[PDB]
Write a protein that binds this ligand. Structure first.
Ligand code: SF4
Ligand code: SF4
Ligand code: FCO
Ligand code: F3S
Ligand SMILES: [Mg+2]
Ligand code: NI
Lengths: 262, 544
């Protein structure tokens, strides 16, 4: 039996959209990944053990002789000593900090873990922070809300088989985040021609005109959405809707109002 | 009879795994039966607080991140909510498209719940290694439809895969499972455990198809991006080739539901017949879904094809209309400031105030929604009871098949078994309607492709969006002042089902449903999981 690298997956202040995204992988499918490629040793959404049994399973993984990689889903709520976000009676910040100390590598799946995400948006009642901020360590960021599984699984496999991929200024692998959404958008011709839809009911909209005047944040958003699509079928602009800039840090605050450029 | 220990004392399960989000369950057990319970949600994010002062058009994009499991449903509720507040009536095509995406969400969500979140409470995976694959193929010929995935060779292949995994010593998501070594509360024959495990692996693939279908209309999954105030943006979803694909993938998913999901559920149901006497509650509420007229909340309530209603004290003879002014939320036993009890959502207050772990006076981040003083169970079981009481043809037929197959009375459905069976019942019904709903949108779209209506932002208004999401009655409530969000409150199915006690000290549905739970082995309390999971808890939904 060839040993499979242990992966510990933690869920902090999250919506589970990133877990959901990960299991949409088809190259390979999630079963082949976990049966053949990695040893997924802790994952709250799907793991059989619960309660103390689950906590023990976590403890065993963190103390495995071969070490482990850490995946983090969700931001970290820090108000009141971290007690607004707890698992097994422990603040999420404390367990993540513990798990990160000895990780071979830390991958942040999603804008939440990467950058703080929706719970951090003003006025940030929970005082949520991104992982890199909260722990004081560099993380490999796979943002989007959620990211494409191609991006997360590709990062994971890259990390286990080649090393750390090249990262931009915001910690994102250039392999997937090196290009602006807008630069690969099929509407770009309309944008260069100043052919904007003024509203969603307009003939312009019906004709597939550019969605810039309706708030599209493609021009300032780094992601591969139009190139790889989602679910092998679509992406937001192809479905007639502006990009929200959901792979950008603090986009909840920097890209809003979503339906404007102001 | 049902395995039961003599155990007396407390049990805490934290985390509850195989749910969305962060839940701690505390119970008091007496002579191996739960005598008291507390449902303690462990995370606060505060979307309602975050939304204050923002563009109402932005609400749907924030609220959809209430949860990624029941993705879409919040963006739908928000969009319904703002459409009401601006008094726009969406075009027929947008009603159709919005409702079809909801249908696709049911299919995806329920498949994943049964197999990947719930089934490990009833299936001992490791014991599948004991099964004979020929004997399992024969048995499968007798609990379900013929299919190649159920042949002996197919079942040997799953068995070999599982064997090499277990012998590797890296058990992964199975580490420390409650069924390791055997467990008195696990009743299936190894032959059934093999079959269910086979389908568990198949389901992991099939859900990718179910999501693909949904993304044809929704733009992407998770977190759709096709709804706008006044309708939908996705003109391409009204067109032929994308719809033809949507139909085709939806047929494959529905083939799996009929071939695997429903027979798997029924077999489990026959083995665990005793669970028809555990975990019941009394009051059921639904806002309905799949309406033919979604021009207003009043029209939604009235024309939902999965009907809306209120049942009280298990009385199937008196299905009441929903009184939307009668809903409120308490916070007495929640982690919020004093002064917050009894608030209609339009007057909703979210003022967070944490005390300490297991403080019996304040033990959850969920508010406690009540209806005229009463707790209400929401979700598939509620929808099923309401539809059955109203003689909705499809519910009648399929409920009857189940009761006829299980040889149990309809009353047996007020239970964790029924809660589980209801989920599958409605999946098979949505499946039966997909081709009709699809054909109605393809024809309509071809004739005229209107998809979004003109509207105007009011200086001052209020509005409510209703949906019956996979986990039940969802409402979003907005107050607009100065063309901005003045107040925005979410009341979510998980809040109804798994919130704490209300202002009167009265247990929520999950807490009541836990009363009388037998615990065969206090070290491995799978029975708590069976019931909790049957409610399909979503704590991120619940608390937001
Ligand atoms: S990044 Fe988005 S999809 Fe992922 S956990 Fe955060 S809110 Fe959910
Ligand atoms: S729709 Fe958005 S991404 Fe596409 S061309 Fe226009 S601004 Fe750029
Ligand atoms: N279904 C679902 Fe999620 C919950 N509870 C929502 O709304
Ligand atoms: S909203 Fe996000 S998923 Fe892609 S199209 Fe824009 S970066
Ligand atoms: Mg609320
Ligand atoms: Ni949810």
């Amino acid at each position: 039996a060839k040993h499979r690298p242990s992966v510990v997956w933690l869920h902090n202040a999250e919506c589970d959209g990133c877990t959901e995204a990960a299991i949409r992988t088809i190259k390979p499918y999630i079963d082949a990944l976990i049966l053949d490629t990695i040893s997924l040793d802790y994952q709250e959404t799907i793991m059989a053990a619960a309660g103390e049994a689950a906590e023990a399973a976590l403890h065993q993984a963190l103390e495995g002789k071969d070490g482990y990689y850490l995946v983090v889903e969700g931001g970290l709520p820090t108000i009141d000593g971290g007690q607004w976000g707890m698992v097994a009676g422990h603040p999420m910040i404390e367990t993540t900090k513990k798990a990160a100390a000895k990780a071979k590598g830390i991958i942040c799946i999603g804008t939440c873990s990467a950058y703080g995400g929706v719970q951090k948006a003003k006025p940030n009642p929970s005082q949520a922070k991104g992982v890199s901020e909260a722990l004081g360590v560099k993380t490999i960021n796979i943002p989007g809300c959620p990211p494409n599984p191609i991006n997360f699984v590709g990062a994971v496999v890259h990390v286990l088989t080649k090393g750390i991929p090249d990262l931009d200024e915001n910690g994102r692998p250039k392999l997937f985040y090196g290009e602006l959404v807008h630069d690969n958008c099929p509407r770009l011709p309309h944008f260069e021609a100043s052919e904007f839809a003024p509203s969603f009911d307009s003939e312009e909209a019906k004709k597939g005109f550019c969605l810039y005047e309706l708030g599209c944040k493609g021009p300032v958003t780094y992601n591969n959405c139009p190139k790889v699509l989602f679910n092998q079928v679509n992406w937001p602009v192809q479905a007639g809707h502006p990009c929200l800039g959901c792979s950008e840090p603090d986009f909840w605050d920097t890209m809003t109002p979503f339906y404007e450029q102001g | 009879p049902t395995p039961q220990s003599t155990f007396t004392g407390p049990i805490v399960v934290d985390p509850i795994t195989r749910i969305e989000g962060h839940l701690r369950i505390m119970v008091e057990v007496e002579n191996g039966k739960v005598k008291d319970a507390w449902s303690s949600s462990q995370l606060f994010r505060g979307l309602e607080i975050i939304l204050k002062g923002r563009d109402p058009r932005d609400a749907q994009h924030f609220t959809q991140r209430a949860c990624g499991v029941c993705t879409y449903v919040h963006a739908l509720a928000s969009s319904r909510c703002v459409d009401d507040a601006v008094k726009v009536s969406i075009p027929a095509n947008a009603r159709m498209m919005r409702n079809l995406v909801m249908a696709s969400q049911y299919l995806h969500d329920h498949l994943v719940h049964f197999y990947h979140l719930h089934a490990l409470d009833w299936v001992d995976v490791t014991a599948a290694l004991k099964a004979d694959p020929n004997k399992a193929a024969k048995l499968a010929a007798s609990i379900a439809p013929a299919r190649p995935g159920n042949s002996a060779k197919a079942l040997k292949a799953v068995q070999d895969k599982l064997k090499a995994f277990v012998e590797s010593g890296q058990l992964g998501i199975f580490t420390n499972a409650y069924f390791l070594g055997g467990h008195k509360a696990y009743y299936l024959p190894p032959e059934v455990d093999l079959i269910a495990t086979a389908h568990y692996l198949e389901a992991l693939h099939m859900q990718v198809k179910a999501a693909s279908a949904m993304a044809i209309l929704g733009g992407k999954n998770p977190h759709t991006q096709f709804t706008v105030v006044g309708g939908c943006s996705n003109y391409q979803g009204l067109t032929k080739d994308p719809l033809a694909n949507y139909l085709a993938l939806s047929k494959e998913v529905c083939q799996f539901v009929n071939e695997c999901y429903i027979p798997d559920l029924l077999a489990v149901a026959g083995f665990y017949k005793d669970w028809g006497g555990i975990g019941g509650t009394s009051n059921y509420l639904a806002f309905g879904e799949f309406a033919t007229d979604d021009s207003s909340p009043e029209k939604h309530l009235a024309t939902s094809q999965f009907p809306s209603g209120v049942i009280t004290g298990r009385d199937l003879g008196k299905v009441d209309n929903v009184d939307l002014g009668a809903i409120y939320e308490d916070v007495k036993y929640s982690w919020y400031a004093p002064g917050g009890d009894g608030k209609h959502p339009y007057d909703g207050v979210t003022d967070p105030k944490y005390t300490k772990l297991d403080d019996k006076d304040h033990y959850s981040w969920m508010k406690a929604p009540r209806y005229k003083g009463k707790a209400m169970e929401v979700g598939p079981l509620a929808r099923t009871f309401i539809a059955y009481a109203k003689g909705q043809p499809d519910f009648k037929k399929v409920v009857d098949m189940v009761l006829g197959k299980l040889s149990v009375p309809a009353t047996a459905l007020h239970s964790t078994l029924g809660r589980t069976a209801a989920r599958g019942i409605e999946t098979a019904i949505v499946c039966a309607n997909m081709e009709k709903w699809i054909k109605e949108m393809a024809d309509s779209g071809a004739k005229d492709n209107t998809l979004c209506a003109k509207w105007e932002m009011p200086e001052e208004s209020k509005g409510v969006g209703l949906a019956d999401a996979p986990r039940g009655a969802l409402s979003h409530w907005i107050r607009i002042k100065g063309k901005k969000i003045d107040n925005f409150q979410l009341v979510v199915p998980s809040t109804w089902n798994l919130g704490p006690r209300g202002a009167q000290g009265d247990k929520s549905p999950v807490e009541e449903a836990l009363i009388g739970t037998p615990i065969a082995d206090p070290k491995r309390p799978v029975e708590i999981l069976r019931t909790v999971h049957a409610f399909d808890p979503c704590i991120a939904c619940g608390v937001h």
